[PDB]
Design a protein around this ligand. Sequence first.
Ligand SMILES: [Mg+2]
Ligand SMILES: [Mg+2]
Ligand SMILES: [Mg+2]
Ligand SMILES: [Mg+2]
Ligand SMILES: [Mg+2]
Ligand SMILES: [Mg+2]
Ligand SMILES: [Mg+2]
Ligand SMILES: [Mg+2]
Ligand SMILES: [Mg+2]
Ligand SMILES: [Mg+2]
Ligand SMILES: [Mg+2]
Ligand SMILES: [Mg+2]
Ligand SMILES: [Mg+2]
Ligand SMILES: [Mg+2]
Ligand SMILES: [Mg+2]
Ligand SMILES: [Mg+2]
Ligand SMILES: [Mg+2]
Ligand SMILES: [Mg+2]
Ligand SMILES: [Mg+2]
Ligand SMILES: [Mg+2]
Ligand SMILES: [Mg+2]
Ligand SMILES: [Mg+2]
Ligand SMILES: [Mg+2]
Ligand SMILES: [Mg+2]
Ligand SMILES: [Mg+2]
Ligand SMILES: [Mg+2]
Ligand SMILES: [Mg+2]
Ligand SMILES: [Mg+2]
Ligand SMILES: [Mg+2]
Ligand SMILES: [Mg+2]
Ligand SMILES: [Mg+2]
Ligand SMILES: [Mg+2]
Ligand SMILES: [Mg+2]
Ligand SMILES: [Mg+2]
Ligand SMILES: [Mg+2]
Ligand SMILES: [Mg+2]
Ligand SMILES: [Mg+2]
Ligand SMILES: [Mg+2]
Ligand SMILES: [Mg+2]
Ligand SMILES: [Mg+2]
Ligand SMILES: [Mg+2]
Ligand SMILES: [Mg+2]
Ligand SMILES: [Mg+2]
Ligand SMILES: [Mg+2]
Ligand SMILES: [Mg+2]
Ligand SMILES: [Mg+2]
Ligand SMILES: [Mg+2]
Ligand SMILES: [Mg+2]
Ligand SMILES: [Mg+2]
Ligand SMILES: [Mg+2]
Ligand SMILES: [Mg+2]
Ligand SMILES: [Mg+2]
Ligand SMILES: [Mg+2]
Ligand SMILES: [Mg+2]
Ligand SMILES: [Mg+2]
Ligand SMILES: [Mg+2]
Ligand SMILES: [Mg+2]
Lengths: 94, 122, 85, 96
Amino acid sequence: QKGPKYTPAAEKPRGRRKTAIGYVVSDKMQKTIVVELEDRKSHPLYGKIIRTTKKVKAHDENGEAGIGDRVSLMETRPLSATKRWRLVEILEKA
Amino acid sequence: MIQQESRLKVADNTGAKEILCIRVLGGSSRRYAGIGDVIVATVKDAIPGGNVKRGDVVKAVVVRTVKERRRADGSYIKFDENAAVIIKNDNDPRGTRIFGPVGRELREKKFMKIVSLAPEVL
Amino acid sequence: ANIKSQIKRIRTNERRRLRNQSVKSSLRTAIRGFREAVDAGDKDKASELLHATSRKLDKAASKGVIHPNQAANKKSALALALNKL
Amino acid sequence: AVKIKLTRLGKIRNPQYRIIVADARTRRDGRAIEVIGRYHPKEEPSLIQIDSERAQYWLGVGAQPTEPVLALLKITGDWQKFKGLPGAEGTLKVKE
RNA sequence: UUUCGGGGGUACUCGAGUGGCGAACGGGUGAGUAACACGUGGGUGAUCUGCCCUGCACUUUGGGAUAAGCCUGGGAAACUGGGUCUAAUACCGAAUACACCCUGCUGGUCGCAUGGCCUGGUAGGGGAAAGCUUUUGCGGUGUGGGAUGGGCCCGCGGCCUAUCAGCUUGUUGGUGGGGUGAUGGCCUACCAAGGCGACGACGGGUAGCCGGCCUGAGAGGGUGACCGGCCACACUGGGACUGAGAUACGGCCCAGACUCCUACGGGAGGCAGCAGUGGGGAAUAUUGCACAAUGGGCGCAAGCCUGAUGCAGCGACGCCGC
Ligand SMILES: [Mg+2]
Ligand SMILES: [Mg+2]
Ligand SMILES: [Mg+2]
Ligand SMILES: [Mg+2]
Ligand SMILES: [Mg+2]
Ligand SMILES: [Mg+2]
Ligand SMILES: [Mg+2]
Ligand SMILES: [Mg+2]
Ligand SMILES: [Mg+2]
Ligand SMILES: [Mg+2]
Ligand SMILES: [Mg+2]
Ligand SMILES: [Mg+2]
Ligand SMILES: [Mg+2]
Ligand SMILES: [Mg+2]
Ligand SMILES: [Mg+2]
Ligand SMILES: [Mg+2]
Ligand SMILES: [Mg+2]
Ligand SMILES: [Mg+2]
Ligand SMILES: [Mg+2]
Ligand SMILES: [Mg+2]
Ligand SMILES: [Mg+2]
Ligand SMILES: [Mg+2]
Ligand SMILES: [Mg+2]
Ligand SMILES: [Mg+2]
Ligand SMILES: [Mg+2]
Ligand SMILES: [Mg+2]
Ligand SMILES: [Mg+2]
Ligand SMILES: [Mg+2]
Ligand SMILES: [Mg+2]
Ligand SMILES: [Mg+2]
Ligand SMILES: [Mg+2]
Ligand SMILES: [Mg+2]
Ligand SMILES: [Mg+2]
Ligand SMILES: [Mg+2]
Ligand SMILES: [Mg+2]
Ligand SMILES: [Mg+2]
Ligand SMILES: [Mg+2]
Ligand SMILES: [Mg+2]
Ligand SMILES: [Mg+2]
Ligand SMILES: [Mg+2]
Ligand SMILES: [Mg+2]
Ligand SMILES: [Mg+2]
Ligand SMILES: [Mg+2]
Ligand SMILES: [Mg+2]
Ligand SMILES: [Mg+2]
Ligand SMILES: [Mg+2]
Ligand SMILES: [Mg+2]
Ligand SMILES: [Mg+2]
Ligand SMILES: [Mg+2]
Ligand SMILES: [Mg+2]
Ligand SMILES: [Mg+2]
Ligand SMILES: [Mg+2]
Ligand SMILES: [Mg+2]
Ligand SMILES: [Mg+2]
Ligand SMILES: [Mg+2]
Ligand SMILES: [Mg+2]
Ligand SMILES: [Mg+2]
């Protein structure tokens, strides 16, 4: 009862990381853009619909995004403080 | 070498840090104070939770002096800062634990509690 | 330190500390030699010193003092620095 | 090494035990992966129940039971079915 | 054997000493913490994992020393030094590895992008073991497959307060290096000036979070007893070694306060573990019995340990029967 040296762990594919779409408002850096996401929820107590927005900054490699454009985003590994995202693609330009 | 208006360290845990000498005791026209001389000193500042508040008039005995004081074998004492120990009428300290060393003269001056309780006698 | 087993493991940990500190210092000296060589800018002597450093890192990693993946990462960085310089 | 534990619940004058597959080093009442049976000996017959399919799956994947768990699942017949030496025997006495 | 002072073997047995394994298990408290700290939801082409089971190679060889013991010194003590000397599953080389770990040259699939997978192919370099028992046999090195365990990032959520309007300088972003199991201002250097901010930032006070409990038809309000899922801490503040795995409670080191022993030369401590005492209070128990059952650790088993746990004692404090 002998044999070579292969007794591994378990496999795992790569699955889903959360996707979102928002508006870019500031491009005064290079190779980074800040994006505002739109979120709609009903208030837990009142039940009335409230519109709230948050700003999230992503990573771009060329600084191809101008002011007032909408883009798609994907989650990534942390790259610095307060940014954890990359850019998917620019669909429209204004 | 402690005089009037002399500015001293406290080597006690009574709650006082700094004392000002009031008089040097021992006799008429008493002029200097040496190791093992009971004096009277006033408290300038104190620990907020200390036992004694600033402004009190308390009897004290000096233990650490900067000036040389000879012993019977010619032994001269130079310390680094003038310090005293707060004492009461019963020739006993007001504190319970002592900072820094002490000289042998206290033993001959009958102050037994201090010399016994000090971390090392020198 | 109140249990005989506890003080026994204190002594054991002390001697393990000495042994592992010696091994770690030896590997650190090898890495220092590589860094000095690459700063000077040699090619051949840097190559044999890289072979020696890779040997010693691989033995240390197989001995468990350093993690095998970290040893591999260090050695791959060594090879990449040699290639670029 | 995941082992078959018996998690304590309830109050003092009646002990509780839950046949749960989980990691060994955790607390006696620690994290529970799946609940498969429950154990309580205070009652007169001390009826015992184990989900045979999940118990067999866990034994196959490599959960190591403690000796009391092994004995109890032998009373149930899970050990007999798993090893296959005698077969699958049912002798457990039902409540009156 | 004996003179009853004791002298030899025995391994049944064993003080102490080496060497492993456990020791991060199990138990406790809610000071700090407005945070991916908590619940839910996925994740890892970016990790590792001893003891368990299971398909599949091998386990050749050489060397030296130390504890223990003996002699001796300091010293009340803890503890230590000097000399002699011993064996090992304690220690270190070397022989294979060609299936892995790295670097340079050449294809197909997938997209979610580096690139991953098809152990892609290719040339060069590198990589480990220890045996015991003769019996329901366990060990050593590696990772194609599974499972547990982790670490990390995020959409969302959940106190009050402008009688708190600007905050920040590794701060923000890029590149190059080091760093870590893993990407990353995690750390460094060089470039540019901004990011966060009235859809309440930064400040101030309070507080462990959640499944739950009470009340209310509901909405909602109050709350975190017990149990259970995490979080954080171990007299106060820090730091690091070991290990597959550390806030390391009864591990280590240092600085503080308190207590204790002393032959004054110096040392020992951390009940918020189970009981118990002093103080505060309105007040909250017994310095109790066991491994019988079950979980946990060791060992081939027998067997050993476990204030985890089962039980008993006190108290009309509560749901319940007499
Ligand atoms: Mg295998
Ligand atoms: Mg495997
Ligand atoms: Mg060194
Ligand atoms: Mg160094
Ligand atoms: Mg290791
Ligand atoms: Mg690396
Ligand atoms: Mg690189
Ligand atoms: Mg536990
Ligand atoms: Mg029965
Ligand atoms: Mg048993
Ligand atoms: Mg023995
Ligand atoms: Mg271990
Ligand atoms: Mg431990
Ligand atoms: Mg522990
Ligand atoms: Mg409690
Ligand atoms: Mg408490
Ligand atoms: Mg807290
Ligand atoms: Mg906060
Ligand atoms: Mg282990
Ligand atoms: Mg050999
Ligand atoms: Mg020896
Ligand atoms: Mg020999
Ligand atoms: Mg060899
Ligand atoms: Mg070979
Ligand atoms: Mg070759
Ligand atoms: Mg092939
Ligand atoms: Mg060996
Ligand atoms: Mg063994
Ligand atoms: Mg998530
Ligand atoms: Mg949430
Ligand atoms: Mg960088
Ligand atoms: Mg990179
Ligand atoms: Mg960083
Ligand atoms: Mg830099
Ligand atoms: Mg709820
Ligand atoms: Mg209502
Ligand atoms: Mg209401
Ligand atoms: Mg709550
Ligand atoms: Mg619980
Ligand atoms: Mg969790
Ligand atoms: Mg602490
Ligand atoms: Mg702390
Ligand atoms: Mg700690
Ligand atoms: Mg403890
Ligand atoms: Mg303790
Ligand atoms: Mg304590
Ligand atoms: Mg207790
Ligand atoms: Mg009281
Ligand atoms: Mg009561
Ligand atoms: Mg047991
Ligand atoms: Mg037997
Ligand atoms: Mg015992
Ligand atoms: Mg016992
Ligand atoms: Mg009880
Ligand atoms: Mg009453
Ligand atoms: Mg009564
Ligand atoms: Mg009644």
